[PDB]
Amino acid sequence: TTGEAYFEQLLDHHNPEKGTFSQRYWWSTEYWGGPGSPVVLFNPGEVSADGYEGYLTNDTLTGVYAQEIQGAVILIEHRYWGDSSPYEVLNAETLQYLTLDQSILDMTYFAETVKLQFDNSSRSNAQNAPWVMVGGSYSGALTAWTESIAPGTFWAYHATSAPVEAIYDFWQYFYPIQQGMAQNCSKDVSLVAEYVDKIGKNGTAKEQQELKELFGLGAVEHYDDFAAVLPNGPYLWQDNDFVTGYSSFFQFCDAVEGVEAGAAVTPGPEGVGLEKALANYANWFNSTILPNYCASYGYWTDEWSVACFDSYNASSPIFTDTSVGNPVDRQWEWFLCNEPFFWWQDGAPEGTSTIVPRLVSASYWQRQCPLYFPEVNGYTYGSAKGKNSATVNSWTGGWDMTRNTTRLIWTNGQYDPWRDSGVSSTFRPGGPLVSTANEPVQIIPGGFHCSDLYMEDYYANEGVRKVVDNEVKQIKEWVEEYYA
Ligand SMILES: *[C@@H]1O[C@H](CO)[C@@H](O[C@@H]2O[C@H](CO)[C@@H](O[C@@H]3O[C@H](CO)[C@@H](O)[C@H](O[C@H]4O[C@H](CO)[C@@H](O)[C@H](O)[C@@H]4O[C@H]4O[C@H](CO)[C@@H](O)[C@H](O)[C@@H]4O[C@H]4O[C@H](CO)[C@@H](O)[C@H](O)[C@@H]4O)[C@@H]3O)[C@H](O)[C@H]2NC(C)=O)[C@H](O)[C@H]1NC(C)=O
Ligand SMILES: *[C@@H]1O[C@H](CO)[C@@H](O[C@@H]2O[C@H](CO)[C@@H](O)[C@H](O)[C@H]2NC(C)=O)[C@H](O)[C@H]1NC(C)=O
Ligand SMILES: *[C@@H]1O[C@H](CO)[C@@H](O)[C@H](O)[C@H]1NC(C)=O
Ligand SMILES: *[C@@H]1O[C@H](CO)[C@@H](O)[C@H](O)[C@H]1NC(C)=O
Fold first, then answer.
1. Which of 34, 108, 149, 412 is the most exposed place for a label (fewest CB within 10 A)?
2. How far is the CA of 210 from the centre of ligand 3 (A)?
3. Residue 291 alpha carbon to ligand 4 centre in Å
């Protein structure tokens, strides 16, 4: 059966006298073998957890784990998202306790002390039963970082597509997309991105304004805000999985290549060249992306509004909305600016081919932190205080937290936009992590973001099936060691 409950979480694990707030969780005993059986714990991470029921079922990898080991499944909503926020208003003062250490200790404290409605004894808490922590994306890093920082509560860990390395100028976000996309699209998108840079850096004012109008963006006043719309094509790669078919991304590349779906004649790998690619990219954005783009934020209603592209308007509701249920993931922007993780999604450095404009730069994103988070009662965000990526990585270990691990398995995707923040990054010093029996790591061929989490990928792709089968057997083997 299923239910939902609240756990009384510590606001500040370092200072319990500051009190508690109520943290939402959901649970399922569909596969549970009774008190003493395993518990699979999954934190949906950078989002409200309400639309995540499926993780209780074997339609997802967490359910498959549970069925394999006779485990309960618990879905825990992250502090400061949804119904797990201590405050109704999120600003630089109230977000002071939205940190990685608090988020890690939330998980161990919960597993050690929660009173589960389905087992009123202590027999299902983590001191008495094996808890398996599973996470994808940021919650996969939360999972790995918990093994690094606070081992000894959870029994085993699986991290898929985990950004365990903080990186400031994360231009590598786009590198696996460039590698996975078609040759002609990649070439033509790069031509357009670099043309946008040339016109921004060397073109006249009349050239800049005219290029903006091609995209429908003549009213966008800051050139870097125009340049920042070009990644909307590449970003669609993040929505791919092995069952999305002729997806939004592949539609974008066909548009750039100037062909309708199913066309008999298509360009070869050489693409269509700058002039056509520019015209096609401009019209694709103007006609397919721009309409109702700003209206999707709720703050605006006009179909052709460009207000949401103006990142220099300190009064924009994108920056001033402090509500918990905001549509701009303000909570995540806090982690980026404050921890700081950064992961700014940028054009590549000079001398390295790029599929997004180099004018989309780390400084362009960093400039927005004080617009999201103006100083409040003396409180500011961590990167303004001088904290940087190494502050985080030297604590957690970053992608070198792999040194001496126990019962942690990793999965990554060959073409995951988050791969190069993780242990399988091609830019990790000493190369990507080498798999061992003690610490396995698998890369899904052709894989995207968290492709082993969704079982539709398992049935659709034999490469995914091989990876899922291996990690499920590894988790079962490790869990059995608890009872042996
Ligand atoms: C030059 O430019 C042209 C014009 O832009 C380029 O042509 C376009 O190329 C696109 C990319 O190749 C192509 O999109 C593809 O369309 C086919 C359908 O025609 C579709 O199958 C593709 O989608 C599959 O693959 C992606 C990538 O992994 C998956 O995200 C997606 O879910 C699909 O996956 C299924 O098929 C894969 C087989 O390729 C399996 O690996 C995967 O597991 C999954 O399998 C399920 O479905 C299978 C159905 O085949 C089934 O057998 C299996 O049992 C599972 O159920 C992708 O959308 C465009 O259509 C094309 N545009 C045109 C022709 O107008 C061209 O590539 C450029 N060339 C160069 C050299 O640069
Ligand atoms: C490109 O975007 C512009 C908006 O900047 C679109 O202009 C609107 O077009 C509709 C007609 O479909 C008019 O009703 C609006 O008054 C226009 N608003 C303007 C010009 O500010 C334009 O249609 C888009 N072009 C394409 C090809 O989609
Ligand atoms: C999901 O559970 C059902 C139980 O009725 C089982 O028949 C099915 O094989 C399971 N699927 C997976 C992928 O484990
Ligand atoms: C800046 O934001 C405020 C609030 O939405 C709005 O009234 C104003 O028109 C915006 N300015 C621009 C140039 O978009």
1. 34
2. 57
3. 19
> Contact at 8 Å (CB) between 279 and 208?
no
- Rounded Cα distance between 324 and 482, Å, is 40
Locate 332 and state its tokens: 């995540």
Cis peptide before 327 (omega within 30 of 0): no
Q: How far is it, in rounded angstroms, from Cα 296 to Cα 308?
A: 10
Do 74 and 25 meet the contact criterion of CB atoms below 8 Å apart?
A: yes
**Ligand 3 contacts CB of residue 472 (under 6 A):** no
Query: Residue 39: left if φ>0, alpha if ψ -120 to 50, beta else—which one?
Result: beta
Active site residues: 137, 416
Considering only CA atoms, which residue is closest to atom 30 of ligand 1? Answer: 242
Give the ligand whose atoms come closest to the C-alpha of residue 225. 4
SS3 of residue 39 by DSSP = strand
Q: Report CA(187)–ligand 2 centroid distance (Å).
A: 29
Q: Is 386 in the pocket of ligand 1 (CB under 6 A)?
A: no
Q: Which residues pair with 75 in a beta bridge?
A: 26, 42
Residue 165: CB partners within 8 Å, gap ≥ 6?
389, 393, 398, 399, 421, 422, 425, 428
Resolution (A): 1.8
Q: Which of 417, 392, 358, 102 is nearest to 238 (CA)?
A: 417
Query: Of 459, 469, 468, which is closest to residue 242 (Cα–Cα)?
Result: 459
* CB-based contacts of 91, cutoff 8 Å, min separation 6: 322, 373, 374, 376, 379
Q: What are phi and psi of 9, to 5 degrees?
A: -90, 150
Residue at 334: amino acid letter: W
Tell me the residue length of the chain: 484
Write out the two tokens for 329.
Answer: 């993931």
Residue found by looking up tokens 């066309």 in the block? 263
> Which amino acid is residue 282, in one-letter code?
A
Angstrom distances, CA of residue 275 to CA of 105, 257, 279: 54, 11, 6
The secondary structure of residue 460, as a DSSP letter, is H
Question: What are the pocket residues of ligand 4 if the criterion is a CB atom closer than 6 Å to any ligand atom?
Answer: 307, 310, 313, 315-317
- Domain residue ranges of the chain, discontinuous segments joined by +: 2-164+397-483, 168-385
Contacts of 69 (CB under 8 A, 6+ apart): 37, 38, 40, 132, 475, 476, 479
Multiple choice CATH, 2-164+397-483, 3.80.10.10, 3.40.50.1820, 3.10.310.30, 3.40.1370.10: 3.40.50.1820
Phi, psi of 136 (to 5 degrees): -120, 155
Experimental technique used?
A: X-ray
Centre of ligand 4 to C-alpha 305, Å, is: 11
Ligand 2 shell residues, CB under 6 Å: 216, 283, 286-287, 290, 304
Structure token pair of residue 428: 């990790």
Ligand 1 binding pocket mutation candidate from 189, 241, 242 (most atoms within 8 A of CB): 242
